[PDB]
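Budget justification note: compute hours in this period were largely spent on complex prediction jobs such as the one shown. Inputs:
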Amino acid sequence: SSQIRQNYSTEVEAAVNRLVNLYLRASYTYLSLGFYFDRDDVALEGVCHFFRELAEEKREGAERLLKMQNQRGGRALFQDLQKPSQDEWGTTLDAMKAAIVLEKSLNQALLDLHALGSAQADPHLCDFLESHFLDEEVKLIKKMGDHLTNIQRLVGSQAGLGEYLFERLTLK
Amino acid sequence: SSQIRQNYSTEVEAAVNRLVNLYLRASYTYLSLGFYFDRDDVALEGVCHFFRELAEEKREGAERLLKMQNQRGGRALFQDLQKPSQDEWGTTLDAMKAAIVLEKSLNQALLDLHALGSAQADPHLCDFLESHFLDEEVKLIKKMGDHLTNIQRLVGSQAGLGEYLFERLTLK
Amino acid sequence: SSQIRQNYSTEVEAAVNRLVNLYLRASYTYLSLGFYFDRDDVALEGVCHFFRELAEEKREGAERLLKMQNQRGGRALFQDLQKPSQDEWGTTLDAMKAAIVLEKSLNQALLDLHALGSAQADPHLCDFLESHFLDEEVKLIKKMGDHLTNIQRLVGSQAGLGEYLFERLTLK
Amino acid sequence: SSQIRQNYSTEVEAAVNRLVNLYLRASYTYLSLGFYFDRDDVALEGVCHFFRELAEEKREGAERLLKMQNQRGGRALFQDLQKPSQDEWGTTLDAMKAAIVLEKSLNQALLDLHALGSAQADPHLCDFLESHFLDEEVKLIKKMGDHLTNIQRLVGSQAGLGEYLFERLTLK
Amino acid sequence: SSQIRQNYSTEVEAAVNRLVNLYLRASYTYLSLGFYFDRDDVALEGVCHFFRELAEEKREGAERLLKMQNQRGGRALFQDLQKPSQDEWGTTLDAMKAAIVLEKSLNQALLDLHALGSAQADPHLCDFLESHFLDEEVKLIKKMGDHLTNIQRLVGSQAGLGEYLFERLTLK
Amino acid sequence: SSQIRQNYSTEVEAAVNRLVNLYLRASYTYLSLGFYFDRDDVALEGVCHFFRELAEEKREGAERLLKMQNQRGGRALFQDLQKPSQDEWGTTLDAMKAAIVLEKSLNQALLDLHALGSAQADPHLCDFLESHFLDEEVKLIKKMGDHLTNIQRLVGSQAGLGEYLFERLTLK
Ligand SMILES: [Au+]
Ligand SMILES: [Au+]
Ligand SMILES: [Au+]
Ligand SMILES: [Au+]
Ligand SMILES: [Au+]
Ligand SMILES: [Au+]
Ligand SMILES: [Cl-]
Ligand SMILES: [Cl-]
Ligand SMILES: [Cl-]
Ligand SMILES: [Cl-]
Ligand SMILES: [Cl-]
Ligand SMILES: [Cl-]
Ligand SMILES: [Cl-]
Ligand SMILES: [Cl-]
Ligand SMILES: [Cl-]
Ligand SMILES: [Cl-]
Ligand SMILES: [Cl-]
Ligand SMILES: [Cl-]
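Corresponding output:
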């Protein structure tokens, strides 16, 4: 094993690889979400953009984890990437609900990894998560909750109109 | 026939002239759409602008086809231009539905011309269409589908309010 | 009829639509003229350019009339566009003679419309014509007469040489 | 199926999704290659950089395919992502040999997709591949062949020295 | 054969080499044309320049074909270059007639190569021709036809005068 | 013969034409050398570049000779261009040896032409050679000898490694 590796458990190494799979799976989900909102029969450009930007953010999260794995002397191992949970995503409301579920699963994986780092006394790992992931996730989940509340307020009234207005005046 | 003309069938030449007629007819339709939304009793400025810009795009499409006809040594022939299918265009929803129908007819004419070019082994024609028309049309039709979905979401609720909001927050 | 419409007769409205047809027909004629001078067996680039620029000017004239129709609360109605009077345009002299005939027909239509506006006491219409069309047409017809005189002086001598020289030293 | 979808076969749609999987698998392989060359006991920074930049290029290829899938009205479907073929990559020579094998498999998939597009008369697909993938792949494979020849010339002599020199004077 | 070569037939490879010979032969012809118009007893500087610039364009065409041959893994093979068809080129009219004959032979060779690429399902080759040669040739042939018409118009009248005027007012 | 021609022998005229053939033949050889080093199975980019730049230099030499031929009132005559002496060029060492042989043949042709100019008392010719060719050739041959010595020093040791290092650290 590495000439560089120091205080880096095989348990963290493996969990890191699993987290990479989760983030790339999340990126794939957002790719599918984005392109669904680009369909001529859905056509909510601002929604498409919001998800496509998240696909990039999650890929970037994976890359950051991969770089860290090499910095610590672990070995990146890639697994098959499951396709997204749906082929069609319903309304903006349905899609944002699915996004916040996804982000909470990522968040919980991050927290689990942190707890493992703390159990293994791996402060570099803890700092890495604290510095590049935990706050970003909190911020993102908050934003999603904000959106959900606004989408919900709009679409009790008259649903199509509310969906359009949200896209035009919050997302675009 | 031309000193320049090479691999340019009489069938493509004629189809090009017909496509010019279709694009100018489309430009005329958008001129009528634009000015209908400028009526004091319709008064949706952002809708007027969206259609007036399309009238310009379609005229520009025609000109591009005419320039190409001369570059290949074909002879532009102009025919009468039929007036638009309607004198009044209803709501923003009605108008966008009519626009996407129109654009799909243009798209199908483009695809037909491409197939003719491919049957005649005219790769300059194919490239010309691929480069200046097929993607533009795809993009435009997608945008229209996006708009339609947003208009529809807005105007199940309460129709006038939705029509106003769309114009103000997506189009203007 | 319009919430905006005021002092705008149905007779002017209809004449405006007819003038739009005439200007678009003129634009089509100039498109054909331009591309004829681009043939490898005609090959007078400066002549091609002079006509292609006029096609744009006439389309722009039509658009200006269409915008005005909507500003006054009239309804644009488009008709078939007749093809140009010729498929081949002869010499630069022949082509300029045909252009000045065309421009005089446009001019006379403009004057007729003005007289109708004056009979209907429609000073907005009169001003619109006076401001954006009557002087432009006068200027253009003068320029064409200038060209014709110079073309004619050149091509009594030795015709091909004169045609080349005009293109090179006046048009290009 | 889509309001936008036109001339886009289910066979191409599916092949596109498969190509996305291949490009993301390639990106994963390059992530593993990059981090292997960052190990303290391998320590060839210029090699690490060369592979890490390729991981980004392949992810970007996938994204471009996903964007195109949505533009055509197809539906992105993601599958599990297999881990890379090796956990340790040997020498720079071994690694470059594995890279060129990988790139040739991507190239052949691209060519297969093109042939399918050509069989389905899908010129947008053909152009998309021709414009954004086929030449890039050719260029890349050439570069890899160049590197391989230079690596091989260096490491018949005295292997460690050659590996160092290549990294320092070609890659860094 | 090449480590890079993929979908590149021996028939295209050979035809490419032949096209290189044709373009370099064309460059040589234009070199001779240029210098003939520089003779003290011909002395038409603008004609000399027009041909000398074409010699450069054709050499550049050859180089572009050679670069492409290497990119595809073909092997450039050079053959003897035949001298130009004439040692003296007559008038500007004679010379432009010879130029357009030459350009049409190049054009037909380009079209033949395209057809071969299409028969071999070599879309990189087709795109290469479409993108860097077919339109350039069309444009050039059109320009030559334009010149020929202007030269001919000038020199029915009084030949020396027309030849001078063309050089001074179109070419210089 | 020319209105301009003065003190320019038919012997020099003919030798100039022959030198043009030699320089274009040299340019062709360098085109083949360049593209050989671009093969995926040779892959020495810096070597490819060094030869491709020489192909341009030799074409430029030919053009300079052609311009001079016209300035003196001679008549450019082009002959077939023989293909290069090899289809594959071996190692960088083999290729540089072939290049210096070629350059010495060009140099000797230049010297022969100078001697002919001196025998014919043609000081314009002598100056032309002295000013634009003899020193360039000396400089180039010296550079090649420098390269050869460095290539040879590198590839007694361990040949592949030396070939790579030379390309990376001298050529690239
Ligand atoms: Au910790
Ligand atoms: Au085609
Ligand atoms: Au009036
Ligand atoms: Au195709
Ligand atoms: Au093809
Ligand atoms: Au001398
Ligand atoms: Cl451990
Ligand atoms: Cl799974
Ligand atoms: Cl035909
Ligand atoms: Cl009709
Ligand atoms: Cl009235
Ligand atoms: Cl009519
Ligand atoms: Cl299908
Ligand atoms: Cl697998
Ligand atoms: Cl073959
Ligand atoms: Cl021959
Ligand atoms: Cl002599
Ligand atoms: Cl020989």
